[PDB]
Amino acid sequence: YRQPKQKLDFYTLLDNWVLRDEAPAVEQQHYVIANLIRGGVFGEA
Amino acid sequence: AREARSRQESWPHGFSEYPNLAIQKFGGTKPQNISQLNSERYGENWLLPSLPPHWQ
Amino acid sequence: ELIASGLSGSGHVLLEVVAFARIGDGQEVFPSQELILDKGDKKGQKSKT
Amino acid sequence: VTDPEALLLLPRLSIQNANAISSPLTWGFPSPGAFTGFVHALQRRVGISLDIELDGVGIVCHRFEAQISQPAGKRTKVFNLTRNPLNRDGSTAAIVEEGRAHLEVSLLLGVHGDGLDDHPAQEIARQVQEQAGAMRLAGGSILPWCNERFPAPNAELLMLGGSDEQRRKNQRRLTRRLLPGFALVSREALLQQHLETLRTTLPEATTLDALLDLCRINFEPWQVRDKPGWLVPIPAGYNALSPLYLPGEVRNARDRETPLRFVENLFGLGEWLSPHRVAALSDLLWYHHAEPDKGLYRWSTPRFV
DNA sequence: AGCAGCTGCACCTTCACGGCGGGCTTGAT
DNA sequence: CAGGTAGACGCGGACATCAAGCCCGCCGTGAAGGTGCAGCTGCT
């Protein structure tokens, strides 16, 4: 689930949120904040 | 010798490794004050090893 | 006077010197450093031996 | 010319900063010319008063350490230098490179003079050892053996004295004192035979010597042709360039009562053996050979093979 | 005023120039 | 003050397959040159 073809994964929604200032629906906002709660290495190249 | 070990295709030639060379420099950063052939090769006396074996 | 009697050709005096310095537990001691002019190339050099 | 009547054994000596760079093409262990000059200095200092003639040195080299470093990403090595004082006006001095090394080496030396008598048997070797402590071997001072666990004494072993079974017992009791070391010998006939072998319709002289030192990991199938033992190039003396000048003509000589002559290096081959596979300890001695009218001031190990 | 001696300055040559490794020696108590 | 002799200790056959092995950014500077000529002060 949450495959990059259907644009509903964490990276796509985060890059749409912080860079282009278009927030998604509230459930996907819960998913991206829960991703930031889980923690990792999310840096680009 | 790298990619034809299992093959019989081997050139009529070879190489040499020369382990444990040592470089020695005569002119510091202006080697032309020593001589002209010392400018052709900058330092690099390239001394050959002649050291005694270690017992164990 | 012993060093003077050795320096005047009479003997060749052999001395043994030991020094104890009290620094502290786990602190840094400073040996001699070597003069290395050619450290080879970046990404692997040492800059203190 | 000389065959020693007795051997003197100096124990394991230590040298702290010897000379690493021995020749314009070689580095490593120092030249045997230093050891022959050392035993001639011992002769000039002690041998006149005690009516003994000291000649010949067998080199052992129990251990050897060099002060070198390998730069990052290169397989070559460089030397660690010293920091000389400033010239004047605060300017740093131009660096002249030199190498250093630490040696632990014992050497046996053959005395043949008729100045050894029935009463002097052990005080001769003690008087030699007390004088060989305040001297240097290759530019490096001899370490003096301060307060430690157990000392090491000399030996004065007579050669002809004793039965032949006792002669082999004396050779075994001398060989047991220097068994964990090695020995440097000169192999010139092997180099000449390899010259005759390698010369097959092509002319070459000195790449012969380069051939016996490298690693021939190349062969048509790969194969690595080996060599008998540790073969190493050594500086075996000098060769003349200029005619011999009279003792007061060369400007800025070392002394003005000796003829001077400009020379250059020669190069030979040698081997590091073990001291238990030779069965002869009157061998392994190094001597000078001058030939003063044509240059070629050489030193070698005669009577070996 | 005229040699000896000290200090400052211009002149000169050359791009680093590869890594999967590579050898041969070591005792007897 | 004391304390045992003897002889022997088993066979067989088998030990598993599957799928994957991270991205990013950066690596210190300073000092390590002879030689010849012009010209400037100080001295006899």
Distance of D29 CA from F37 C1′ (whole Å): 47
Question: Contact at 8 Å (CB) between B16 and B36?
Answer: no
Contacts of D181 (CB under 8 A, 6+ apart): B55, D60, D61, D62, D105, D106, D275
Decide: helix, strand or coil at residue D111: strand
Question: Contact at 8 Å (CB) between C35 and D80?
Answer: yes
Number of Cβ within 10 Å of residue D92's Cβ equals 10
Q: What is the DSSP letter of D258?
A: S
Closest residue on chain D to C11 (Cα): D134
What part of B 9-28 touches D (C-beta under 8 Å)?
10, 12-26, 28
Strands D107-111 and D54-59: antiparallel
By C-alpha to C1' distance, E22 is nearest to D217
Number of Cβ within 10 Å of residue D56's Cβ equals 24
Mutate to test the interface with D, among B50, B54, B55 (most CBs of D within 10 A): B50
Contacts of D205 (CB under 8 A, 6+ apart): D195
Q: Is the CB of D121 under 7 A from strand F?
A: no
Residue C3: both structure tokens together: 């060093």
Name D residues 70-109 whose Cβ lies under 7 Å from strand F: 83, 92-95
Strands D238-240 and D54-59: unpaired
Chains A and D touch, using 3 or more CB pairs below 8 Å? no
Give resolution in angstroms.
3.2
Contact D232 B21 (CB under 8 A): no
Which DSSP string corresponds to chain D?
----SEEEE---EEEEEEE-B-SSSEEESPPHHHHHHHHHHHIIIIITTTT--EEEEEE--SEEEE-EE--TT-S-BEE-B--PPP-STTPPPPP----EEEEEE-EEEEE--TT--SS-SSHHHHHHHHHTTSSBSSSSBBP---S-S-----EEEESSSS-HHHHHHHHHHHHGGGTTS-EEEE-SHHHHHHHHHH-SSS--SSHHHHHTTS-------------SS-EEEE---EEE-SPPBPTTTSTT-S-SSS-B--EEE--EEEEEE-TTSS--SSSS--EEE--TTS--BEEE--S--
Residues of D at the B interface (Cβ-Cβ below 8 Å)? 21-22, 24-29, 61-64, 66, 68, 75-79, 94-95, 97, 99, 180-182, 184, 210, 213-222, 230, 232-234, 272
Question: Contact at 8 Å (CB) between D109 and D137?
Answer: no
Contacts of B51 (CB under 8 A, 6+ apart): B20, D28, D29, D64, D66, D232
* Cα–Cα distance, D83 to D98 (Å, whole number): 12
Q: What is the DSSP letter of D164?
A: H
Question: Contact at 8 Å (CB) between D53 and D113?
Answer: yes
Residue D86: both structure tokens together: 């400033």
N-terminal to C-terminal alpha carbon distance within chain A: 25
